[PDB]
């Protein structure tokens, strides 16, 4: 301690008596076996003497491996000024299992001892540092709870980690922390801090000794911030018949607004059971308690997904060695082919489709057109797949859904317009009418995979026009009218008329989609079936070897994140001329009868694909090779070559 204020931690809940009991007739806390002194000493020992043996430089960026990890963390804290120390419960478990167990089972008691230990170490060292408040230790990566509904009541008020998807986040709730009372006779002022969730009012003035003259001034008090996170749990242990689970989380004073709807997170927090009043106006409480999680730590990192927007935005994400490795990979000649083959390793020989998916993941170049007065430009890449229910179109959509962060899924008629855009529901914890988002908005800066796009009624299909054209969503209903942002990438999958591609019909009628809807797509892949014995034999061997069973996903994630962070391709003169020529030629070829015609929307599609290829190469400059690849992909997809003026 250096005189810096010790900030109250609402995430730990209202304090307790902290009663101490001697176990002999050593000095544990009542109901626990923590022994604050021993716990603090052991945590200081862990913090000053922990080395991760099998750590990796890739895993730990900006950290000297040999030097104590959390001491380096304290150095970073001193450099920056944010008094939050993120500690790994797995590291705690490895160092001392008993300390890990005590932390897990008694968080509200153990954690403040960790705060004391960390502050002692951090002010014994760096004795001149300035911080707005003492350091707060945030544990995380507890032993994952597979299914949150396997939690028994004997697991209440203890630390757990869950994985979920953020469905909704409420407005900020001002939580009082220090009531400011003032006498209405002599104006003497006093302050009362939250004792155990209750503020014992003065009841008598300490200046004029008048009884019940002290009025609580609301706006001269000290307040905290609270937020309610409605998170749909994403359990990995799903027993027969169990349905999706929605859980309530509460974030306090710094984790507020740190997660937006659509974000997949690992939340570490205290499992809290609370009473429910039978009525809002009575103090009777039902004998059955409803549970919710008090959040301690958000974790946006997952090993089987790409990097989120926040992770990409953060600068110190890659080491210099990793950056150089990524640059080398981009410097390789066939990086495009390598990444495409990396995509979906279990699906055989869809090279063009996987290239389209890769360009979709990389996106285009985000551009600002505010000055032009032109309206936002969609930098996302929309892809349609077409083929009977015998091809891997649905498998590709599922793979993209399981891969990308902010991935939403829809299928057939299981969706509606309001359920894809927004609606109004009475929040069943505040009894207030709150607005809720649809799948498209939940996948705002991600991908919406829409299977069975053909069997999708016009009422819900017509919403996608606005999303795929302007990236906005102007909901104008009774209560409030507002223009939400859905900058989503559409990955649609549609079946041919009569659920098979009959070679007696032309492509447009076989597809059976409006010209406007098809033009809104910048890629269309007709997953036709070639009656090739070679293809059939290769696929059969592939599947049998799959039954009796590379470019690593980690470096794939790193490449995509680096490209999004830094590479911002721009148009060169040769690329501009190539694009103009390509658009003219595309119009000429597509001016036939049954072919999918071409429009300025197709020109913009070529522009986006060229920018995506430039990103794939880390070029930062769109040029002739990029334009040529865009043209070749846009042709091979939709198979302009195999077609003819006599379409069919």
């Amino acid at each position: 301690v250096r005189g810096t204020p010790v900030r109250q931690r609402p995430d730990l809940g209202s304090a307790q008596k902290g009663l101490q009991v001697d176990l002999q007739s050593k000095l544990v806390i009542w109901g626990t076996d923590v022994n604050v002194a021993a716990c603090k000493e052991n945590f200081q020992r862990f913090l000053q003497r922990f080395i991760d043996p099998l750590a990796k430089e890739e895993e730990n960026v900006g950290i000297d491996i040999t030097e104590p990890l959390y001491m380096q963390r304290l150095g970073e804290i001193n450099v920056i000024g944010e008094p939050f120390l993120n500690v790994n419960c797995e590291h705690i478990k490895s160092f001392d299992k008993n300390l890990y167990r005590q932390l897990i089972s008694y968080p509200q008691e153990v954690i403040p001892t960790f705060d004391m230990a960390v502050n002692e170490i951090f002010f014994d060292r760096y004795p001149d540092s300035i911080l707005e408040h003492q350091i707060q230790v945030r544990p995380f990566n507890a032993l994952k709870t597979k299914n949150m509904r396997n939690l028994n009541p004997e697991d209440i008020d203890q630390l757990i980690t869950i994985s979920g998807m953020v469905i909704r986040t409420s407005q900020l709730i001002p939580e009082m922390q220090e009531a400011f009372f003032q006498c209405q006779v002599c104006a003497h002022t006093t302050r009362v801090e939250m004792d155990r969730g209750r503020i014992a009012e003065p009841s008598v003035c300490g200046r004029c000794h008048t009884t019940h003259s002290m009025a609580l001034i609301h706006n001269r008090s000290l307040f905290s911030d609270k937020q309610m996170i409605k998170l749909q749990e994403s359990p990995e242990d799903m027993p027969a018949g169990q349905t999706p689970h929605t859980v309530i989380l509460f974030a306090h004073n710094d984790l507020v607004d740190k997660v937006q709807p659509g974000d997949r997170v690992n939340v570490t927090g205290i499992y809290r059971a609370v009473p429910i009043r039978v009525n809002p106006r009575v103090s009777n409480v039902k004998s059955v308690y409803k549970t919710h999680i008090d959040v301690i730590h958000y974790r946006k990192t997952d090993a089987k997904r790409l990097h989120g927007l926040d992770e990409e935005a953060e600068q110190k994400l890659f080491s210099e060695k990793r950056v150089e490795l990524l640059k080398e990979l981009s410097r390789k000649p066939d990086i495009y082919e390598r990444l495409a083959s990396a995509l979906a390793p279990s699906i055989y020989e869809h090279e063009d489709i996987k290239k389209g998916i890769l360009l979709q993941l990389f996106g285009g170049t985000r551009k600002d057109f505010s000055h032009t007065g032109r309206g936002k430009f969609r930098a996302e890449i929309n892809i349609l797949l077409c083929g009977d229910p015998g091809t891997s179109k649905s498998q590709l959509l599922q793979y993209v859904y399981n891969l990308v962060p902010r991935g939403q899924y829809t299928s057939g008629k299981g969706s509606s317009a309001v359920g894809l855009t927004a609606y109004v529901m009475k929040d069943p914890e505040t009894r207030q009418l709150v607005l809720q988002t649809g799948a498209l908005v939940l996948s705002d800066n991600g991908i919406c995979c829409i299977d069975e796009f053909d069997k999708m009624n016009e009422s819900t299909r017509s919403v996608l026009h606005e999303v795929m054209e302007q990236q906005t969503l102007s909901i104008a209903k009774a209560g409030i009218i507002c223009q939400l942002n859905a900058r989503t990438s559409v990955l649609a999958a549609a079946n041919p008329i009569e659920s098979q591609w009959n070679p007696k019909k032309t492509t447009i009628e076989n597809i059976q989609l409006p010209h406007t809807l098809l033009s809104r797509f910048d890629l269309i892949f007709l997953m036709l079936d070639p009656q090739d014995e070679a293809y059939d034999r290769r696929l059969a061997h592939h599947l049998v070897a799959l039954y009796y069973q590379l470019l690593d996903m980690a470096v794939l994630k790193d490449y995509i994140a680096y490209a999004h962070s830094t590479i911002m391709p721009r148009l060169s003169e040769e690329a501009s001329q190539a694009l103009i020529e390509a658009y003219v030629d595309m119009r000429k070829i597509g001016s036939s009868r049954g072919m999918v015609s071409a429009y300025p929307r197709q020109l913009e599609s070529l522009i986006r694909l060229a920018e995506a290829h430039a990103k794939v190469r880390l070029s930062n400059k769109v040029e002739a090779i990029d334009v040529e690849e865009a043209k070749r992909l846009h042709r091979e997809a939709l198979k302009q070559s195999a077609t003819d003026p006599r379409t069919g």
Partner: protein
């Protein structure tokens, strides 16, 4: 001894010194000159520049910013003394201090609890504005147990009775009677604002909060406007229906109930005075200004005065500039190739005609409506977005994303009184402006009927949830329509091509057809324009007039109401005869007297664009040419 708030009193003294000593460049007492106007009734606020305050005394400005809530009453008292020692304002009159030009601006997402009680400025979009009710600021109560008068008890954004009767031997804490004739009130309005489009994070609804406008700021924010509110984030207690117990306030006196009166249950809670502490963040805006003012400073003369010298000189130059028509077209749509007729029509829509009411009361429509129907990917949505972005009071909506209530209006009941607030719809927010309906054909008849009534009688009648009203909606319509089957057919009529109801179509002043002719020259030109736009983003746009200048010119010209001279009448009738003779091949739609009315409105719009006081044969000729070009022939094999 009535403990003194020394910090606040020091702030009051310093602020009074600032008022009575600060001077402008001229060297006179600017705030003395301003307070000279405070003597008049219905005028009780003084506007003070935070820039001026910071210049005069940085420490005072920082103190005010960091302790605004606690010191604000003292600043008001300082201003009251400043006004009194000069003039003879009524003794009971109150004065308020509005602050403006605060250097820093925060985001509604950043309005955390740490911002409570300290000065801040935010930008928001007004959703709806409640009426102007008197509010209780300090009431004098009567005790019903001993008839003791407890005087000047403040109200903390809630009806607060005296915590205890003054009489020492009387512990009355319940039975008080407010004395209205002795209490003081202030003007009060609650306005719901929401987060602007730019500030939205990913996948989030625009956060909404209500701001409280006190005296002299009480009818300055209107629904749909972008406004900067400067004031103080506050917390107002609320009885929230939280099922779970939370924070509670109770007395520290260690009383306990005797047998038969055990202080338990509801009796125990009422004895201990347990009351839940639930709060909601509210904004107490001391001033409101437009986020992007049109003028640096509602008839033509008033607009002229509101304009600055430089702004008026620019407007006069543009008015005197021949070729202003083409200049404005290019500036409005620099990034759209071709479609000169469409650009001209949209410009004439933005300008509008002169609405009139006959002696019998018939309201002759004065604003023109334009519908663009064309092949896919022909810049219809782009025209709509251009107009929405440029024009003020320019609402945008899709064909099927809106309901009738969200497209015309809705009714809610004032949560603070018996009256009814009207949640304006898109056609109301676009009042005296433009409404851009994209995918116009794809709209249900249940909404097309509302749009038709709007375009018909320039009004929206609402009879819902206990209130009847007749809102005015003088909004032009810009529609985008897809032909049946998607592609326009040149061998059919416009009615056969589009599926808009005949009453809807009949009153569209202009109908522009954008047929996607697969022509090499146009393909190359459009490709060049698009690739140039995507290569040279910030450059490549050279609009001879900036959008702000065009907006100011529109606001000035709209105040002009062109006449129609006898020569103009003769030319008009001759042109109508010529158009009828054209009607007599087959046009995509016939020519009726509605075409004559549209032509008259277009001529008025041209005269207004040139700011002429008389409609001229040149304007009439331009309108007739535009209409004739719009009406295309039906080519058949």
């Amino acid at each position: 001894l009535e403990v003194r708030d020394e910090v606040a009193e020091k702030c009051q003294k310093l602020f009074l010194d600032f008022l009575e000593e600060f001077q402008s460049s001229d060297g006179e007492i600017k705030y003395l000159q301003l307070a000279e106007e405070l003597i008049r009734p219905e005028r009780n606020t003084l506007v003070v520049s935070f820039v001026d305050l910071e210049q005069f005394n940085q420490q005072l400005s920082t103190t005010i910013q960091e302790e605004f809530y606690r010191v604000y009453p003292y600043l008001c008292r300082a201003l009251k003394t400043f006004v009194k020692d000069r003039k003879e304002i009524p003794l009971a009159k109150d004065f308020y201090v509005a602050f403006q030009d605060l250097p820093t601006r925060h985001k509604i997402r950043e309005l955390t609890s740490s911002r409570i009680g300290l000065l801040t400025r935010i930008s928001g979009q007004v959703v709806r504005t409640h009426p102007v009710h008197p509010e209780l600021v300090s009431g004098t109560f009567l005790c019903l147990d001993c008839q003791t008068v407890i005087r000047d008890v403040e109200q903390q954004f809630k009806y607060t009775q005296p915590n205890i009767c003054r009489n020492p031997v009387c512990a009355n804490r319940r039975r008080f009677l407010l004395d209205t004739n002795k209490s003081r009130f202030v003007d009060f309005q609650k306005v719901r604002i929401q987060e602007t489009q730019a500030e939205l994070p990913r996948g989030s609804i625009p956060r909404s909060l209500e701001v409280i406008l006190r005296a002299e700021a009480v009818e300055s924010a209107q629904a749909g406007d972008k406004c900067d509110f400067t004031g103080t984030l506050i917390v107002v207690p609320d009885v929230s229906k939280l099922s779970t117990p939370g924070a509670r306030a109770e007395t520290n006196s260690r009383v306990s109930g005797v047998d038969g009166y055990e202080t338990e249950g509801i009796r125990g809670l009422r004895a201990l005075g347990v009351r839940d502490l639930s709060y909601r963040l509210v904004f107490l805006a001391c001033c409101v200004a437009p986020t992007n003012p049109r003028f640096g400073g509602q008839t033509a003369e008033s607009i002229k005065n509101q304009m600055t010298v430089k702004e008026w000189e620019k407007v006069f130059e543009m008015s005197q500039d021949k070729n202003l028509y083409h200049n404005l077209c290019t500036s409005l749509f620099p990034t759209i190739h071709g479609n000169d007729e469409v650009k001209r029509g949209v410009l004439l829509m933005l300008f509008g005609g002169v609405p009139k009411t006959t002696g019998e009361g018939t309201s002759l429509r004065g604003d023109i409506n334009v519908c663009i129907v064309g092949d896919p990917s022909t810049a219809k949505s782009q025209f709509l977005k251009h107009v929405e972005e440029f024009s003020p009071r320019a609402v945008y909506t899709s064909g099927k994303a809106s309901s009738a209530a969200g497209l015309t209006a809705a009714v809610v009941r004032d949560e603070e009184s018996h009256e009814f607030v009207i949640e304006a719809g898109a056609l109301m927010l676009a009042d005296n402006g433009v409404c851009c309906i994209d995918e116009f054909d794809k709209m249900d008849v249940r909404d097309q009927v509302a749009i038709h009534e709007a375009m018909e009688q320039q009004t929206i009648s609402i009879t819902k949830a206990g209130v009847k009203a007749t809102l005015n909606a003088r909004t032009s319509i810009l529609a985008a329509a897809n032909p049946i089957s998607g592609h326009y057919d040149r061998s059919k009529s416009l009615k056969q091509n589009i599926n808009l109801s005949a009453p809807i179509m009949s009153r569209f002043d202009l109908f522009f057809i954008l047929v996607d002719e697969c022509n090499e020259v146009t393909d190359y030109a459009i490709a060049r324009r698009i690739v140039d736009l995507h290569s040279r983003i910030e450059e490549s746009i050279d609009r001879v007039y900036s959008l702000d200048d065009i907006r100011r010119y529109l606001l000035f010209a709209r105040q002009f109401k062109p006449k129609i001279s006898k020569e103009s009448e003769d030319f008009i009738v001759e042109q109508y005869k010529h158009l009828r003779q054209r009607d007599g091949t087959k046009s995509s739609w016939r020519i009726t007297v509605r075409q004559l009315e549209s032509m008259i409105r277009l001529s008025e719009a041209m005269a207004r664009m040139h700011c002429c006081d008389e409609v001229q044969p040149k304007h009439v000729k331009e309108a007739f040419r535009l209409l004739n070009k719009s009406i295309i022939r039906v080519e058949t094999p």
